[PDB]
């Protein structure tokens, strides 16, 4: 309220909050290397009208070889970031 001498009364001030204590992270016990070393490094790379689709589940994602090796001409992400993608558990990645 910007005074040394302040009159008497309940005066508003800041908003307190209890700082949190620790950390709780809860994932499944799903524990598996992905087929990214072969679903990307594949053999049968199809046509365009006959584009291939795989659903991949039950895995643990790496996102690490994709950056430390510049084999890729165009990297692009749309509804998502690139690097912070390795925070979240996902449902059913789709290789197209």
């Amino acid at each position: 309220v910007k005074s040394f001498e302040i009159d008497k009364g309940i005066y508003q001030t800041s908003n307190f909050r209890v700082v949190p204590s620790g950390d709780v992270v809860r994932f499944p016990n799903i524990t598996n290397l992905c087929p990214f070393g072969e679903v990307f490094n594949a053999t049968k790379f199809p046509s365009v009208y006959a584009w291939e689709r795989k659903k991949i589940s039950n895995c643990v994602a790496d996102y690490s070889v994709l950056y430390n090796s510049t084999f890729f001409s165009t990297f692009k992400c749309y509804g998502v970031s690139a690097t912070k993608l390795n925070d979240l558990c996902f449902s059913n990645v789709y290789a197209d």
Partner: protein
């Protein structure tokens, strides 16, 4: 409300200046205004009184008007019907960010002030307020109140018992016309419905998007990193800021209407109760013999002992 919490949002919030300080000041002022409202409406007799428990005056039944010692609680039966009539639509523990503050005046003591006003109305003489009380036995009250219509006690004492009867039944019919009835207790429900829809629409604004990817924080926070991040977050904060500012300004407009009605509320608990208000079709649709306060959720409900003059003759002048 805004900005719910991450880390980045507080920095982007204090980008926009003292908006947090502005809104919290304005709602603090509205809170203090509602404090002033209930003080100036009710706390108008300083020196309180006693529920006298004579309760029968020739035939003058104040049944259920006053809370009674025979009750379990201390809220009067009429007002208990009033509480039961009015709906909604430990402490509040919800991360909207919001709250209803508790009121200042204690709810039973809201009722105790109503009891005080009604009881000293039922006693104490006309001079009541500007003084304290002057020992008048309440039939001398209406014998005095016949001057605020300009007639004699030949009304009162020549018709004594009859008058009380037309009192009691109608009050009992009050018990009908407030239990059995409907929307003719509207404006309290109307006030709560305004605030319900306004605040719930504000909640839905927290569900609302503003042209961003998500409509909720911590969602984008896993797939935002940088400039993309702060663009989407600026959209969210901008919209939540505009919507909340809209809410605050409408709360202020509402509170202005409430305080004009509160001026009226003090005016009808003063002019109509503490004396007889000689002005015409102000208190009620009669010549306004008495009127009694009653509490209610978030508002006051009066009881206007009006006066309908009704028989008909023909004469020559």
């Amino acid at each position: 409300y805004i900005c719910g919490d991450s880390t980045e949002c507080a920095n982007l919030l204090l980008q926009y200046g003292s908006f947090c300080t502005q809104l919290n000041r304005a709602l603090s002022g509205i809170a203090a205004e509602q404090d002033r409202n209930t003080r100036e409406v009710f706390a108008q007799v300083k020196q309180m009184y006693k529920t006298p428990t004579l309760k029968y005056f020739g035939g003058f039944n104040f049944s259920q008007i006053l809370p009674d010692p025979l009750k379990p609680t201390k809220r009067s039966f009429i007002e208990d019907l009033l509480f039961n009539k009015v709906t909604l639509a430990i402490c509040a523990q919800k991360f909207n960010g919001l709250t209803v503050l508790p009121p200042l005046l204690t709810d039973d003591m809201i009722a105790a002030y109503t009891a005080a006003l009604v009881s000293g109305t039922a006693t104490a003489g006309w001079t009541f307020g500007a003084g304290a009380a002057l020992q008048i036995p309440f039939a001398m009250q209406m014998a005095y109140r016949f001057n605020g219509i300009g007639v004699t006690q030949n009304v009162l004492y020549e018709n004594q018992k009859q008058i009380a009867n037309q009192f009691n039944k109608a009050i009992s019919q009050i018990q009908e016309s407030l239990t059995t009835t409907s929307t003719a207790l509207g404006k309290l429900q109307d006030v709560v419905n305004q605030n319900a829809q306004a605040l719930n629409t504000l909640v839905k604004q927290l569900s609302s998007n503003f042209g961003a990817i998500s409509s909720v924080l911590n969602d984008i926070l896993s797939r935002l990193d940088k400039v993309e991040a702060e663009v989407q977050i600026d959209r969210l904060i901008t919209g939540r800021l505009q919507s909340l500012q809209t809410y605050v300004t409408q709360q202020l407009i509402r509170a202005a209407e409430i305080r004009a009605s509160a001026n009226l509320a003090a005016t009808k608990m003063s002019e109509c109760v503490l004396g007889q208000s000689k002005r015409v079709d102000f208190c009620g649709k009669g010549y306004h013999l008495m009127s009694f306060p009653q509490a209610a959720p978030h508002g006051v409900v009066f009881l206007h002992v009006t006066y309908v003059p009704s028989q008909e003759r023909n004469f020559t002048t």
